[PDB]
Design an enzyme around this catalytic site. Structure first.
Site, PDB file in Angstrom:
ATOM      1  N   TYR A   1       0.848  -1.187   0.000  1.00 58.56           N
ATOM      2  CA  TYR A   1       0.000   0.000   0.000  1.00 58.56           C
ATOM      3  C   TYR A   1       0.885   1.238   0.000  1.00 58.56           C
ATOM      4  O   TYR A   1       1.582   1.514   0.982  1.00 58.56           O
ATOM      5  CB  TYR A   1      -0.931   0.001   1.209  1.00 58.56           C
TER       6      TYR A   1
ATOM      7  N   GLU B   1      -0.200   4.654  -0.847  1.00 59.11           N
ATOM      8  CA  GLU B   1      -1.105   5.756  -1.134  1.00 59.11           C
ATOM      9  C   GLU B   1      -0.336   7.069  -1.205  1.00 59.11           C
ATOM     10  O   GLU B   1       0.572   7.323  -0.409  1.00 59.11           O
ATOM     11  CB  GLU B   1      -2.197   5.839  -0.066  1.00 59.11           C
TER      12      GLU B   1
ATOM     13  N   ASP C   1      -7.536  10.727 -26.143  1.00 60.77           N
ATOM     14  CA  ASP C   1      -7.657   9.391 -25.572  1.00 60.77           C
ATOM     15  C   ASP C   1      -7.128   8.403 -26.609  1.00 60.77           C
ATOM     16  O   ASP C   1      -7.874   7.767 -27.350  1.00 60.77           O
ATOM     17  CB  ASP C   1      -9.104   9.114 -25.178  1.00 60.77           C
TER      18      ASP C   1
ATOM     19  N   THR D   1      -4.258   3.805 -22.485  1.00 56.34           N
ATOM     20  CA  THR D   1      -4.120   2.516 -21.832  1.00 56.34           C
ATOM     21  C   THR D   1      -2.718   1.976 -22.058  1.00 56.34           C
ATOM     22  O   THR D   1      -2.098   2.216 -23.097  1.00 56.34           O
ATOM     23  CB  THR D   1      -5.138   1.515 -22.372  1.00 56.34           C
TER      24      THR D   1
ATOM     25  N   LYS E   1      -3.243  -2.847 -25.204  1.00 53.68           N
ATOM     26  CA  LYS E   1      -3.475  -2.598 -26.643  1.00 53.68           C
ATOM     27  C   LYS E   1      -2.163  -2.426 -27.332  1.00 53.68           C
ATOM     28  O   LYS E   1      -1.223  -3.153 -27.047  1.00 53.68           O
ATOM     29  CB  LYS E   1      -4.351  -1.389 -26.873  1.00 53.68           C
TER      30      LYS E   1
ATOM     31  N   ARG F   1      -2.403  -4.186 -17.862  1.00 54.42           N
ATOM     32  CA  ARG F   1      -3.607  -3.362 -17.876  1.00 54.42           C
ATOM     33  C   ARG F   1      -3.472  -2.222 -16.877  1.00 54.42           C
ATOM     34  O   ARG F   1      -3.542  -2.432 -15.663  1.00 54.42           O
ATOM     35  CB  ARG F   1      -4.837  -4.211 -17.578  1.00 54.42           C
TER      36      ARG F   1
HETATM   37  C1  LIG Z   1      -9.685   0.344 -24.430  1.00 53.16           C
HETATM   38  C2  LIG Z   1     -10.049   1.909 -24.306  1.00 53.16           C
HETATM   39  C3  LIG Z   1     -10.194   2.540 -23.102  1.00 53.16           C
HETATM   40  C4  LIG Z   1     -10.006   1.830 -21.723  1.00 53.16           C
HETATM   41  O1  LIG Z   1     -10.679   0.603 -21.560  1.00 53.16           O
HETATM   42  P1  LIG Z   1     -10.396  -0.126 -20.228  1.00 53.16           P
HETATM   43  O2  LIG Z   1     -10.586  -1.638 -20.402  1.00 53.16           O
HETATM   44  O3  LIG Z   1     -11.325   0.390 -19.182  1.00 53.16           O
HETATM   45  O4  LIG Z   1      -9.005   0.148 -19.813  1.00 53.16           O
HETATM   46  C5  LIG Z   1     -10.507   3.907 -23.078  1.00 53.16           C
HETATM   47  N1  LIG Z   1     -10.682   4.618 -24.272  1.00 53.16           N
HETATM   48  C6  LIG Z   1     -10.545   3.996 -25.444  1.00 53.16           C
HETATM   49  C7  LIG Z   1     -10.738   4.777 -26.779  1.00 53.16           C
HETATM   50  C8  LIG Z   1     -10.224   2.614 -25.472  1.00 53.16           C
HETATM   51  O5  LIG Z   1     -10.080   1.958 -26.697  1.00 53.16           O
HETATM   52  C1  LIG Z   2      -8.465   0.214   2.061  1.00 49.93           C
HETATM   53  C2  LIG Z   2     -10.067   0.356   1.897  1.00 49.93           C
HETATM   54  C3  LIG Z   2     -10.668   0.692   0.714  1.00 49.93           C
HETATM   55  C4  LIG Z   2      -9.880   1.004  -0.601  1.00 49.93           C
HETATM   56  O1  LIG Z   2      -8.920   0.050  -0.996  1.00 49.93           O
HETATM   57  P1  LIG Z   2      -8.143   0.394  -2.289  1.00 49.93           P
HETATM   58  O2  LIG Z   2      -7.500  -0.817  -2.837  1.00 49.93           O
HETATM   59  O3  LIG Z   2      -7.099   1.414  -1.985  1.00 49.93           O
HETATM   60  O4  LIG Z   2      -9.121   0.972  -3.321  1.00 49.93           O
HETATM   61  C5  LIG Z   2     -12.068   0.800   0.662  1.00 49.93           C
HETATM   62  N1  LIG Z   2     -12.852   0.557   1.800  1.00 49.93           N
HETATM   63  C6  LIG Z   2     -12.257   0.224   2.946  1.00 49.93           C
HETATM   64  C7  LIG Z   2     -13.107  -0.049   4.223  1.00 49.93           C
HETATM   65  C8  LIG Z   2     -10.842   0.121   3.008  1.00 49.93           C
HETATM   66  O5  LIG Z   2     -10.228  -0.229   4.215  1.00 49.93           O
END
Ligand SMILES: *Cc1c(COP(=O)(O)O)cnc(C)c1O
Ligand SMILES: *Cc1c(COP(=O)(O)O)cnc(C)c1O
Ligand SMILES: Nc1nc2ccn(CCCCCc3ccc(C(=O)N[C@H](CCC(=O)O)C(=O)O)c(F)c3)c2c(=O)[nH]1
Ligand SMILES: Nc1nc2ccn(CCCCCc3ccc(C(=O)N[C@H](CCC(=O)O)C(=O)O)c(F)c3)c2c(=O)[nH]1
Ligand SMILES: *Cc1c(COP(=O)(O)O)cnc(C)c1O
Ligand SMILES: *Cc1c(COP(=O)(O)O)cnc(C)c1O
Lengths: 462, 461, 462, 461
Positions: free
Chosen positions: D54, D56, D209, D235, D238, D244
């Site tokens: 973690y 953050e 984008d 992204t 691709k 990802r």
């Molecule tokens: C693939 C894509 C994304 C992001 O898709 P995710 O699976 O959510 O990462 C965003 N914009 C465009 C134009 C894309 O082709």
């Molecule tokens: C740590 C936590 C999250 C968020 O976790 P992330 O992976 O950072 O998104 C959400 N809810 C609770 C109660 C958490 O302890």
């Protein structure tokens, strides 16, 4: 067709209706706390040629021409407004264009706040107005609650007045940007300084909705919220005894100092409040109402008006102390302003039942939700006001009499609630039961004959 | 103190002002198209005992009591509101409680739409109102543009008419929930049938804001938007010649038959009323509500049929007079009470002609033209026939009004040759005692011509 | 280029960085309550070919083809999720596509609520997470507070736990549509039944954010919020000891009966929750994380995992009772779950000062705001967790030792706070003062040599 | 229990699934244009010890402690993020913490825009993504269309390109605060200079984008949107061939010189980062962040320069092969990695060809065409060169991929002559043992052709 014909020689169907409402106003005891009778001097300017004038904008900054005369009426209504409340035109301005009380408040939120910004206002059944934000736990009632997120602050159901501490608690969690210290059914004063402490604490704004008590503040008989509030809205009827319109008192000038530069930090209230009224929310101002208001603001800076407000205050207690000593309890102990919050629960009846009975004998009040209530369709308590009848030159003995009328009318339905079931049953017998029908026609004749001989203000005929 | 003292005695400072405006209205030519002269009968109801009656709610469903008489008034107004526009009481309702036209429009939006829903109205420089969503290049001006997201449609500058083809093209991408068919500076008739089709296609409500043409619709001298709109807002002043208030006409009863056989209803009556009260407004201005019902009774009479029909003949007479004097009219001419004038050809701009005509008691307002950006000194005037037609003006009288206007135009034209900026222009009219004279002789000639015409309403205030 | 080269023989700059973090993980005492070490069986599926697969949609309803194998991994991750928490697949579903903990919660609001609808969640310095809505009295921090209006409920600063009554008070005034019973720095259990009483009272929704306690609920060692909550979100790390992902447990089936018709009223939670994740908020699911989660959910329904959670609970008290008997106070009395809320105020130091000192000797915790705090830049107290080290087969004696490490490290800066001024001064001496620099290199060597001989999970080399 | 047991032993049920997908990826022709094959080096960092950290915050400004190493990783990723796109570190920053491309776009909107501000993106049936605001005819689909008001722009159906002229016309009425220059099903190059002009005119931000073309931009085989955009989201999968994740490139430093001489700054760096954390996300997926930096280091190498340049030659080879076989290509051809095919001429619809090609392990996706409403069975396919080019495919190999496709087309064509509805079609392919055979012989022929090609990543999972 010249357009100068009389209302009688042209539209008689409306003329008879006008006189019937006049006769109904004169023959009856008006106890709506927000009602009052207007002076003919104001009604004359209300039905004037000023209705035929479009003056969109503000004096010196119209978007037309020929506003030369209405610019002198607004600038005079503005001067008379600050006059009536003893406000230095360097620390205060006013917007005299609000169409009524509700459009005045909606403009202040639109001016200062952003959509869905947070608002705290006294809950409606706790003696508030819906323009303070009223959500009904199902749907958003007031547009204040739709366009902005509103959370109400409540009364202490024991003391019967404003819980200045639970409000001082919620404001820190809710972090509102505006708290509205104003009432529509609350018989005490308001600490417009603890509110300002709460507002300065949560960095909010203190909005004073001094309607209902508009005149009492002008006549210097009760404390003025302008001492610690920064934006003050009000209507022009209710107490100020004018035509139907609204006002928005905003503070101008300098807010404070830059403690590390010495530069002037100005009150940025003005141009936002003025912009929200026009062009944002409204269009053509009702200049005929601005004049009828400026007329009533003139006759409000006068000692005649202080005698009025003082009689209003004295007529409230003389109605409370009379009602106290007849078998009736008073919410918030008693009163401290123009109206009293009758509690009919320790009397076996309610405001919804008493109203329809009282309404049937030319005595007009309204229902009211008291703290000691159990529902909504049968609220326990009535709202009784002074300024309406006091304008007919009513005295303490004149009000202790209508209490004897009220108690002589309450105990008419009290034998029917003990003889019928619910509201739909209650009212049904009042109209065919000759033992009660003829029992009302006596009180109506006695109420009409008593009231009709008091000097009603305004025109004689309409 | 009795409250029955006259204003002439109680407050002279204000009483002396009612006469300064009554004289100014009587002595001047009134061409502000949104301005008419209310009858005395309606003005009597304006300053009546009804100002002292809090009647929150609607006839029957009222919070307080004692509204036994003002219920008959609001029910009479609702009856006369429909009879004036030939509306079946089983197909149309009306809310007669909007304080003015702007609060009337906001009630429709609050009733039908959720916050930030989409509204389309004609652009403000193109002829639309503020309440149709006006959004500046930097700020949100109208409150409609704040509590809702608004996209405007524009005129076709080549024809001066509404480009109903770009509206349909833009309303498919924007996908609004409400399109407004109302105008302020539009000299032509709105294709309400073309509007409803667009509203039907994109699943939207058609709102008709006929504030300027409400009296023409009532007299059936122009096509009625009720035949194509399902929500109709209007002002009770302007061409309706009544006190300042607003009305909302909506549809009720059977919407259509379900394709089953279920009876689909109309859902306007209860949302509209709830928006006006308790949502937005409060105590109904029962004096205006009654004063409105007087103006509506007049609108059902042949006198209004002749008045409104005369308003049209006078706008053409004003239009044809300007045309014969070499004036450009937006959209070529007019089909209603308005006449849009384009002063860019003659050499002056609307901001200068409005000042000169104002100094000779000819009240008009500057109007933008199809072409020049809103960040430009307007090169157009907006002229209206309703006001002076109430003063029994006729065709031969407006040709004279145009003559007085043209003399005023040639003054600012001479001054513009002498003046550089605009703030300098509005000083040369007041200081240069040679042009100060020229305006005085035109002001006097105009006021003498106007005073001879009758004025609806009281004589002294 | 074939794409099959090693990470070492190709990108060594990243490979050395990977091993350094591995060495840093192994040589140190990890006490972040939300951290934990993942099993190699899960990390293997995390770095799998499943990263190369676009499967937008849900099993049986993809918008592509060739999702035939990932449809069996989601439908298995869904089955293993309901398995790990003993949930009838007729009363519960799950969305395994949330990218992490925060995106999981944001989807639930987006699913059930409308923009600017009302939300109540435990305040952040009162041991909450910002995804519950956190406004900083100046700006809206969390997007939960931007897109929805959030008002927090607070702790009783005396008892140190959740004020279930002041929350039961505000909910009636605020009328929220969703209350989030979940924590990120709170050492007691939560009454997921008084919340449901408050939620049923104000017609709200009860959202269980059982992250931090995800595994303790699965191992049946602490009460499960699924008993009275209707929507339960959680992450997959923290306790469940999986890869970084999120889950949304929603109740399906029948809500109740039509008492006057007998018709079935269904739980309408499912299709809204599933729609908010895709298409509304996300796109291509991280199928390689769904697999690494399903792996960790399998090894969570096992008795090996209950022994883990039980050791986690016992290691918490053995760290609290050890810290209690050494000159340290415990917020909320002590603990009842996996973490303890140390209060360093009755010890002359704070979490911000202790962290940087502890952080410098391979002991990693974080600051924390306790009720008895006075500001923000110097919060009084630390957050200490069990699940991180318990995965290295830590026992009660192994945790009472790191407490002896902590107290032997707290009293290192305690002679510097009494010798320096503020935080910027505190940390400055720790790096050049050879009397303290060499004093830390002893503890670091003693902490590293102590910890590095514990069985770290996951790969040996990275 | 040690947590070091292999997956093959700890959980066989899942391990047997990693091989079913590894075989399916190895045995099939992958034409989903948003799909590539991640390298083994990056996949090693995906399943690393960084999943247990973690961290953050951002390098330096971090809440917790012990991030001394993952700071160097995120700072190395930020360094390699810019070097891949030839960006001056004093003119550009990058946020490498978006969990994916969709949370990357939402971060930009949340950072720059207030709720219900206006965004314009290409329509989804026209080639745009969900995250550019997709709003159905009845429901709000994308979350961008919910927390913001979105109006889409459309293609010019006559040319298959973006109608930059209708965008400029519609962006002046809509007045958006952000216009998106990103696409999914667009076979051509985006006129980023024409976009920025429109964004400049209406006082809007230009968002690029480039998720589909990020690898082509990195290798400088197509024009770079950084030369005209000021916010660039992408992204890391691709055409970038990485794990990802999502990246946000923004501008920083001097915006322009004030007209005075004041140095106007860029205000993206601090709003963008604050939106990603603490506003929207939380714990950064440090494993993906590190796996991304491996793919970025490859993108700076000549191998990627040859890979991306080959991706273009293979799309043309796929385009020209379809053209020579009588196939309609949207926009006539292609200028990138994509090839949009129009099957309406040949007689089949994209929903049927997607099923047949799927049954022979040729993964494509149906695509709407310029013309047919979204409420229609799509008559188009979307084909992509990135995936198989990573498997060392070349020009002569895609002409074979088209040959295998055409044989698959002529099967559904024969089936469509035999089948009535569509749900019947997807049963005749599975029951009729004469066509069940025909698909088996094409599936086998395809899989034999594909397996011989190398596959980036691990051998067994
Ligand atoms: C693939 C894509 C994304 C992001 O898709 P995710 O699976 O959510 O990462 C965003 N914009 C465009 C134009 C894309 O082709
Ligand atoms: C740590 C936590 C999250 C968020 O976790 P992330 O992976 O950072 O998104 C959400 N809810 C609770 C109660 C958490 O302890
Ligand atoms: N066609 C048509 N004709 C008429 C004739 C009268 N009206 C009624 C309304 C008159 C004009 C509306 C208005 C009113 C005020 C402003 C305004 O305040 N603008 C900027 C503020 C922006 C900033 O502060 O940046 C400023 O001046 O400061 C405006 F920009 C338009 C109309 C109409 O509505 N439509
Ligand atoms: N050009 C381009 N190509 C591709 C290829 C993949 N993607 C990624 C996204 C795939 C499609 C997005 C989607 C996803 C789901 C729906 C959806 O649920 N619709 C209705 C709901 C309405 C109602 O309920 O009324 C329904 O099915 O029920 C949708 F309507 C579009 C894209 C892209 O984004 N753009
Ligand atoms: C009565 C009242 C109003 C509204 O008055 P209306 O004329 O109905 O708009 C607003 N505020 C307060 C405090 C009121 O008492
Ligand atoms: C005059 C007008 C209105 C209403 O103006 P108000 O002065 O607020 O009543 C509304 N719409 C149009 C088109 C108008 O001309």
């Amino acid at each position: 067709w010249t357009g100068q014909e009389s209302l009688s020689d042209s539209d008689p169907e409306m003329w008879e209706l006008l006189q019937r409402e006049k006769d109904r106003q004169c023959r009856g005891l008006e106890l709506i706390a927000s009602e009052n009778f207007c002076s003919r001097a104001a009604l004359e300017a209300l039905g004037s040629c000023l209705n035929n004038k479009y003056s969109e904008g503000y004096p010196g900054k119209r978007y037309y021409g020929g506003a030369e005369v209405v610019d002198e009426i607004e600038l005079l209504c503005q001067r008379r407004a600050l006059e009536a409340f003893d406000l230095d035109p360097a620390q205060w301005g006013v917007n005299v264009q609000p169409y009524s009380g509700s459009p005045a408040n909606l403009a202040v939120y639109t001016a200062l706040l952003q959509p869905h910004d947070r608002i705290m206002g006294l809950d409606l059944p706790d003696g508030g107005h819906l323009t303070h934000g009223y959500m009904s736990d199902v749907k958003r009632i007031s547009a204040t609650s739709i366009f902005f997120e509103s959370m109400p602050y409540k009364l202490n159901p024991k003391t019967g007045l404003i819980d200045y501490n639970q409000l001082a608690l919620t404001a820190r969690l809710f972090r509102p940007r505006l708290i509205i210290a104003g009432t529509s059914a609350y018989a005490r004063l308001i600490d417009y300084a603890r509110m300002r402490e709460v507002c300065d604490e949560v960095k909010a704004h203190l909005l004073a909705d001094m309607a209902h008590i508009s005149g009492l503040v002008a006549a210097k008989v009760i404390p003025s919220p302008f001492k610690h509030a920064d934006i003050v809205t009000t209507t022009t009827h209710k107490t100020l005894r004018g035509a139907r319109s609204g006002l928005i008192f905003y503070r101008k000038g300098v807010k404070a100092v830059d403690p590390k530069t010495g530069r002037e930090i100005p009150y940025t209230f003005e141009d936002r409040i003025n912009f929200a009224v026009f062009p944002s929310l409204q269009g053509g101002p009702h200049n005929h109402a601005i004049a009828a208001v400026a007329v009533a603001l003139k006759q409000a800076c006068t000692p005649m008006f202080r005698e009025y407000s003082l009689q209003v205050l004295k007529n409230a207690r003389a109605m409370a102390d009379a009602l106290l000593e007849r078998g009736y309890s008073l919410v918030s102990g008693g009163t401290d302003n123009h109206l009293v919050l009758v509690d009919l629960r320790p009397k076996g009846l309610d405001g919804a039942r008493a109203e329809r009975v009282l309404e049937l004998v030319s005595i007009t009040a309204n229902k009211n939700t008291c703290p000691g209530d159990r529902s909504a369709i049968t609220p326990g308590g009535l709202r009784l006001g002074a300024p309406a009848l006091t304008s007919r030159q009513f005295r303490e003995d004149d009000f202790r009499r209508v209490v004897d009328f009220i108690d002589e009318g309450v105990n008419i339905g009290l034998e029917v609630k003990s003889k019928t079931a619910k509201l739909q049953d209650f009212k049904s017998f009042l109209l065919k039961d000759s033992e009660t029908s003829q029992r009302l026609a006596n009180l109506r004749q006695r109420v009409e004959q008593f009231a009709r001989a008091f000097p009603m203000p305004g025109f004689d005929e309409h």
